[PDB]
């Protein structure tokens, strides 16, 4: 299961210059990548929660899993997006 | 901006998370964080693929531009199996 390709295409096209083009096969590929990004973080967060017999994956678990797996730079933006969101 | 991110289906994200064998309950916060994370990830992935698109003198970004970027960036090693 994957995020809608329309959503993925719009983020990708913001990333590149106006002039540029993205082949559908490169969009399908980023689609797959994103699902794997999620599953890989989730898997780390989840293995941690089980060790400390915790039944919910919380946001802190995710954020710590990112940090640990070398996505530490994602942490302040995510936190701020949370603040902003449910402010 | 952030609003593009608000359009991302949280249910779809919860459904992916739930594939994991050791995940029963998930806090609401989680899919939200992933929504934004998804945006940051896609952006950096494509910027980095774009380098290879241009080195090859094309204006079209292709699956092998992605594949090259995964190999030149240690943060994308978890993708080795996805993009051979």
């Amino acid at each position: 299961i994957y995020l809608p390709i329309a959503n993925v295409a719009r983020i990708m096209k913001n990333a590149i210059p106006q002039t540029g083009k993205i082949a559908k096969d490169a969009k399908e590929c980023v689609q797959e990548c994103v699902s794997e990004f999620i599953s890989f973080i989730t898997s780390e967060a989840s293995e941690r929660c089980h060790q400390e017999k915790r039944k919910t994956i919380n946001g802190e678990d995710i954020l710590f899993a990112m940090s640990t797996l070398g996505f530490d730079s994602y942490v302040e933006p995510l936190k701020l997006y949370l603040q902003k969101f449910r402010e | 901006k952030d609003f593009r991110v608000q359009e991302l289906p949280l249910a779809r994200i919860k459904k992916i998370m739930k594939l994991d064998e050791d995940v029963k309950m998930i806090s609401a916060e989680a899919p939200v964080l992933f929504a934004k994370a998804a945006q940051i990830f896609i952006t950096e992935l494509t910027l980095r693929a774009w380098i290879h698109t241009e080195d090859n003198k094309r204006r079209t970004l292709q699956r092998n531009d992605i594949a090259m970027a995964i190999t030149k960036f240690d943060q994308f090693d978890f993708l080795i199996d996805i993009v051979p």
């Binding site: 794997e36 599953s39 890989f40 898997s43 780390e44 070398g70 | 994991d20 090693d77 978890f78 199996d81």
Partner: peptide, 18 residues
């Protein structure tokens, strides 16, 4: 291989096969 990711990557391979 990224040393931070390596163990998680080995596990995920097991999970996806299943």
């Amino acid at each position: 291989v990224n040393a931070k990711q390596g163990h998680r990557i080995x596990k995920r391979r097991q999970a996806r096969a299943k």
